RNA sequence: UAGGAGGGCGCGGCGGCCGAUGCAAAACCCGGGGCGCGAGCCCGGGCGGAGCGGCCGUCGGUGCAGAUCUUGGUGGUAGUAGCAAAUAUUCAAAUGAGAACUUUGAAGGCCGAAGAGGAGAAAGGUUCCAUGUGAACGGCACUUGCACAUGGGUAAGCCGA
RNA sequence: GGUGAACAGCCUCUGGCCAAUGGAACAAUGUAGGCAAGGGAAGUCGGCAAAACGGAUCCGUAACUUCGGGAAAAGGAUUG
RNA sequence: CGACUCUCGGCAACGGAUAUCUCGGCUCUCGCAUCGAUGAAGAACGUAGCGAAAUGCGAUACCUGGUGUGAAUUGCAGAA
């Protein structure tokens, strides 16, 4: 719930569904799928990933 | 050239056992440069990697033995 | 000098008494040793068909006479030890059998 | 095991981050004595025992 | 037998990680830590082992609070 | 860095060293003791002809148990010798390295010969082995330091 | 012999006295020359590169060949005993400085399905996967790995808790 | 899958392997496994070890007995 | 003559004694009295541009603020 809320306030998008897992090294990793209104390419280049 | 990454990824794709994948000896260069399941599938469709046929276990003597028991 | 000759390897007398789990490997050792004596080259390469022929009848029975052809040829490899080697392969046998077949020399 | 408590996963994370040979550069810090990492652990030799 | 035949059946845990002391000494069935006595209110400590008294006395930890008490004593517990 | 025995003449000599060599000290002692005072070229030929199992290196001091052979009747009449391959190969690597150093100085390689060959134990490397009744024992190698000096022959 | 007493040699300090010391102190080595019946002492040679003695008084954790003595190291033993159950390996090729041990292909055999097959509970903890690798390890060997280094990987409203 | 009463053993297919350090030789003594003329326990403390019997169909099955057993008793015959 | 065994002498190894040290220990003496429900000792997890440990610190995380001093930190790189 907090992950979707923050992904909305930052980056001004929404998540249609988030998956989470705690990676073995220790931190948590979250897969935030965007509702297909927004484009992940566009966000990845708005923050610089790819 | 070690192809232990390609006997696996091929028994998985060809859905056989590692003893049924056949990798042509002549083109180990291209087989080795093939580095993914996607590339294994293009090699399978291009004919370099083959499913060997199943070893024959014919029941013909069994059938003849029964057809001589009736 | 490059040369191809057809020999008959009496293998019973060279494998007699050998342990079963070793009669075929000793058959291959005797083929190499026989090519070495016959053509003086230390390097003998056995063709996969000669191997298959010898190994086809198990490990504990091997053909008794194997009509082989040994081809001493030039070692064309720029890096090499010897100036020539011998490549032994299985050889076609006439229908009349090995009756009176000596050592011939192939054209 | 495959069903591990979050406490044990939490502590495996740290016993993972505690396995690296000492950095290459520490070795030149002034008046230095740390030579190799004498607190290595191997999965087959020294069991954590927890 | 005893020995080789019998060390193969070590498969369960008598002790898991205690929460008050962090050691692997929490007897599960008995529900008590064999090192810090837990869940008892007071800590298990005995004078037949001064070594085990020093290994877990005061001073071997962060002293997150009392390390500042001497400094606060100097200047007589002052707030500005 | 400086060896046990300095050459007769230092300007006409080449030297090669190997420290902490992982090869059996006893085998390489007997190799050196077989090779001392041979010519460089006959030493290369002899030592390769040993590596190729054609001619033997007699065992004299550390020889209790070494079985007999005929290939060594020339230099040890009782016929007791072996063919240390790993040691002969290490000594060949040092012989080639000293022949190279002698070429770099500028001596007649064909006139070189083994002036001074020494084998000398090094720090034993350790590994543990397992014995009946759960008793573990040392399993330790005896590596050697091998030094040699090739000096040009003089009339 | 047990045992006793006297006079001495030696070690480490303390209070004094006499000095040596980068023209080489301490320590240690010698087929070096001596002195003493003896503990020991003096000098030479060498390595060594910074501190050291001798005398009187005084003190003490002071003298080693033993204790199935403690710790550490090193021998002979000894290149010796030995690496032997689970049927089995062989031939071309390729890579590599190097091939019995890596990889491919052809062959020949074994597990023979209450399996030497496919999955889990426990327990382990990153062993999983890729790229590479000087050592060490893999009780032979290695181009190799469950070894070493750098990265990657574990997604649940429905399986669980 | 086959034989077989059978998840016995023995061979095969799917799947997995050839991982157990290799080369040469056939001496004693060993360890595991065989075979032996005439005799068959004389060996030995003791038939210890090994051999002989072993499936199935048909017949027959004693003393004794708690009348349930003995019993697959014993002794025979057949097998493709 | 030569090999082996014992040995003597020179050098080189093996090994870490001896000598010179010492941000350590031990002993004696002295000064003060200051933990915790306003959450302590201890434990755990995190925390650095490149850190694992030790040393700090707590999502403000090898620190923030004040004050004093008065030009650095430092294995490297970087804003200064
Ligand atoms: Mg989840
Ligand atoms: Mg284990
Ligand atoms: Mg049980
Ligand atoms: Mg219990
Ligand atoms: Mg022997
Ligand atoms: Mg044990
Ligand atoms: Mg004393
Ligand atoms: Mg004292
Ligand atoms: Mg003593
Ligand atoms: Mg032996
Ligand atoms: Mg054995
Ligand atoms: Mg079952
Ligand atoms: Mg399994
Ligand atoms: Mg090894
Ligand atoms: Mg793996
Ligand atoms: Mg049937
Ligand atoms: Mg069956
Ligand atoms: Mg008989
Ligand atoms: Mg009898
Ligand atoms: Mg008798
Ligand atoms: Mg009798
Ligand atoms: Mg009797
Ligand atoms: Mg019996
Ligand atoms: Mg009866």
UniProtKB/TrEMBL annotation, chain B:
Record field: compositional bias (Basic residues): 54-64
Family designation: Belongs to the eukaryotic ribosomal protein eL19 family.
Name this polypeptide is given: Ribosomal protein L19
Organism: Triticum aestivum
Lineage summary: Eukaryota, Viridiplantae, Streptophyta, Embryophyta, Tracheophyta
Whole sequence portion shown: 2 to 71 of 213
UniProtKB/TrEMBL annotation, chain D:
UniProt keyword Transcription regulation present: no
GO biological process, one term: translation
A molecular-function term among this protein's GO annotations: structural constituent of ribosome
Keyword Coiled coil: no
Compositional bias of kind Basic residues: 4-15
Domain of life: Eukaryota
TM region positions: none
Keywords: Ribonucleoprotein, Ribosomal protein
GO cellular component, as recorded: cytosolic large ribosomal subunit
Family membership: Belongs to the eukaryotic ribosomal protein eL39 family.
Name recorded for this polypeptide: 60S ribosomal protein L39
Species annotation: Triticum urartu
Gene: LOC125524779
Residues of the full protein shown: 27 to 76 of 76
Automatic annotation (TrEMBL), chain E:
Gene3D superfamilies cross-referenced by the UniProt entry: 2.20.25.30
Domain of life: Eukaryota
Pfam families hit by this protein: Ribosomal_L37e
GO MF annotations in UniProt: RNA binding; rRNA binding; structural constituent of ribosome; zinc ion binding
Swiss-Prot/TrEMBL GO biological process terms: translation
Protein residues bound to Zn(2+): 18, 21, 33, 36
InterPro entries xrefs: Ribosomal_eL37, Ribosomal_eL37/eL43, Ribosomal_eL37_CS, Ribosomal_zn-bd
GO cellular component term of the entry, any: cytosolic large ribosomal subunit
UniProtKB keywords: Metal-binding, Ribonucleoprotein, Ribosomal protein, RNA-binding, rRNA-binding, Zinc, Zinc-finger
PROSITE patterns: RIBOSOMAL_L37E
Coiled-coil zones: none
Residues binding Mg(2+): 29
Similarity comment: family membership: Belongs to the eukaryotic ribosomal protein eL37 family.
Function as written in the Swiss-Prot or TrEMBL entry: Component of the large ribosomal subunit. The ribosome is a large ribonucleoprotein complex responsible for the synthesis of proteins in the cell.
PANTHER family: 60S RIBOSOMAL PROTEIN L37, RIBOSOMAL PROTEIN L37
Name of the featured protein: Ribosomal protein L37
Organism classification: Eukaryota, Viridiplantae, Streptophyta, Embryophyta, Tracheophyta
TrEMBL record, chain F:
Entry annotated with the keyword Ribonucleoprotein: yes
GO biological-process terms attached to the record: cytoplasmic translation
Pfam families, A to Z: Ribosomal_L22 (PF00237)
Keywords recorded for this protein, A-Z: Metal-binding, Ribonucleoprotein, Ribosomal protein
GO terms of molecular function: structural constituent of ribosome
Record keyword Metal-binding present: yes
Family: Belongs to the universal ribosomal protein uL22 family.
Protein name, as recorded: Uncharacterized protein
